[PDB]
Amino acid sequence: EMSCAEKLLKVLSFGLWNPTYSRSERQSFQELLTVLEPVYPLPNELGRVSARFSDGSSLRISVTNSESIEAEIRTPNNEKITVLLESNEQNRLLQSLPIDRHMPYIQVHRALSEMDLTDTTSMRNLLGFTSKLSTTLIPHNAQTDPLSGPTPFSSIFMDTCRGLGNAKLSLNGVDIPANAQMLLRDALGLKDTHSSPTRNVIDHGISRHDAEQIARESSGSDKQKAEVVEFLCHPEAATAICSAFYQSFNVPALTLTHERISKASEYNAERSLDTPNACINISISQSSDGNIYVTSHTGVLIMAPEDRPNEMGMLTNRTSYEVPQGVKCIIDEMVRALQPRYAASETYLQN
Amino acid sequence: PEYDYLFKLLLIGDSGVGKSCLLLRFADDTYTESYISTIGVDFKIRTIELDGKTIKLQIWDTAGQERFRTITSSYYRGAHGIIVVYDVTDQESFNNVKQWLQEIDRYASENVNKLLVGNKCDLTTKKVVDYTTAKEFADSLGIPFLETSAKNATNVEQSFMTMAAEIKKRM
Numbered sequence A: 001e002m003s004c005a006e007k008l009l010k011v012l013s014f015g016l017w018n019p020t021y022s023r024s025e026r027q028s029f030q031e032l033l034t035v036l037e038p039v040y041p042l043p044n045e046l047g048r049v050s051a052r053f054s055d056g057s058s059l060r061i062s063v064t065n066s067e068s069i070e071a072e073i074r075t076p077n078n079e080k081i082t083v084l085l086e087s088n089e090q091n092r093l094l095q096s097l098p099i100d101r102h103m104p105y106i107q108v109h110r111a112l113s114e115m116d117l118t119d120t121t122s123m124r125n126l127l128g129f130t131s132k133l134s135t136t137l138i139p140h141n142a143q144t145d146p147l148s149g150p151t152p153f154s155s156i157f158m159d160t161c162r163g164l165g166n167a168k169l170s171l172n173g174v175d176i177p178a179n180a181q182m183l184l185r186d187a188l189g190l191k192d193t194h195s196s197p198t199r200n201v202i203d204h205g206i207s208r209h210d211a212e213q214i215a216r217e218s219s220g221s222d223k224q225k226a227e228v229v230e231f232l233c234h235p236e237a238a239t240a241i242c243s244a245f246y247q248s249f250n251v252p253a254l255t256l257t258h259e260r261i262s263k264a265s266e267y268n269a270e271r272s273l274d275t276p277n278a279c280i281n282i283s284i285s286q287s288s289d290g291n292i293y294v295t296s297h298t299g300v301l302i303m304a305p306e307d308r309p310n311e312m313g314m315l316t317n318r319t320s321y322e323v324p325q326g327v328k329c330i331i332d333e334m335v336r337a338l339q340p341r342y343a344a345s346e347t348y349l350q351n
Numbered sequence B: 001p002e003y004d005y006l007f008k009l010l011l012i013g014d015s016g017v018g019k020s021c022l023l024l025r026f027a028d029d030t031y032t033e034s035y036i037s038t039i040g041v042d043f044k045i046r047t048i049e050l051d052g053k054t055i056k057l058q059i060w061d062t063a064g065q066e067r068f069r070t071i072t073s074s075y076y077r078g079a080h081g082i083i084v085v086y087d088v089t090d091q092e093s094f095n096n097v098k099q100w101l102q103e104i105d106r107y108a109s110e111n112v113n114k115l116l117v118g119n120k121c122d123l124t125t126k127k128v129v130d131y132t133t134a135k136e137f138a139d140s141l142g143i144p145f146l147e148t149s150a151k152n153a154t155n156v157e158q159s160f161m162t163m164a165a166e167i168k169k170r171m
């Protein structure tokens, strides 16, 4: 009687893109795969991933800086087995986890399924998949570095107002739907697009009362909903949430790709395709040690390179960073404290 | 032969000021808040009629956060017309108009058409840049000026028509 976590580990091991999977089976994998969540990595880890399932099984994969991969499975009965996994060209294990790697090339994936690209829903759905796959780190210099220049972070509060209620947001693996996102917009004191957060939230975080209301409207288990309230009550939660939406995180990656993105924009405008310019999907976690990690993804339509005309895909830009304790929701403090990595991949459809 | 003229338009101006909202109001006569920020460049198309002439407008909506300036500036050179937007409730956005015109000077075509637009003019209780101030400025530069509201639709259509007439005359 096989567990959720066990199931996913089997797939990842055999290969999520394995040609011997019956497609109806690829359905199943999505539902499992999207429970996967990036979380705070330890000092010699390149990436750490966690998934807590509704049958009470959990899974934890570590990837060392040397790219050695171990899984830890907890069955609902709370038995622990620790599995040592190998990634190779048949399973593509490392390609199929939310991890950034130091590759010499931007990683390319193939979307599995009839995930078209006609509208808002399909695009979100695409980003919903790609942001569980790997990405290739991109360096910046002083010109592209999203935190350098005369006004780093100027736009965050605006970015947060426009993002909340239009994002896919996850706090400790708990899905925060649009309604609850709106409450969160209010709770931070960002009622309108011109204001900053309330002096009170900046210093004491969200009131327990708002925090409690937000989690009641949200999805996931009662034990998980508990950590969300505890999470939002920190002053640092405000900092993680707003910083997550900074638009310029995307500059390193576009500096590499924008012409191909614009090309896709025009292709779509010329056909009356009602596609959003961009989509966001954020995952924020606080470990049982109180460590706060943010992973933010922006998905954006992009044309294949010249050799494959009229084909269209998504570029996903991933931004990861710890929010250290004591770092409060102010522009000035976000700048000299936060240290993001940027990574990107390109995903193409099965059309 | 399905349009008589084809003009490229560019919308530049600070982040927050309502560039996407203006474009959305012009293209679809809608205003909502269900959109996340513009990442890089956005693009829309609207055909208008002007003196019995069918004008296809290709409009590009840029991101105005400082770090985007460089990549964004590659879109200036093809443009027929450039609209500079500021927020009538945000003094800093108006001060920056001066920089945006330098970017135009630096990257636009030499005889590109300009228009200055002061958006959000429905926020009367919050307005901090006076019409006469902005209008005097646009004058010293010989640039046309309007205040608008993507929200109420105030002067949005005028804005683009004006720009289109301006270009039509040049050609």
Ligand SMILES: Nc1nc2c(ncn2[C@@H]2O[C@H](COP(=O)(O)OP(=O)(O)O)[C@@H](O)[C@H]2O)c(=O)[nH]1
Binding pocket: A162, A193, B013, B014, B015, B016, B017, B018, B019, B020, B021, B022, B033, B037, B038, B064, B119, B120, B121, B122, B123, B148, B149, B150, B151, B152
């Ligand atoms: N009251 C009012 N608000 C506006 C108007 N235009 C834009 N806004 C608000 O300002 C926000 C930013 O608009 P946006 O188009 O994203 O600015 P952009 O960075 O130039 O694309 C929007 O979410 C709107 O809520 C307007 O004409 N009137």
Ligand SMILES: [Mg+2]
Binding pocket: B019, B020, B037, B038, B042, B061, B062, B063
């Ligand atoms: Mg915009």
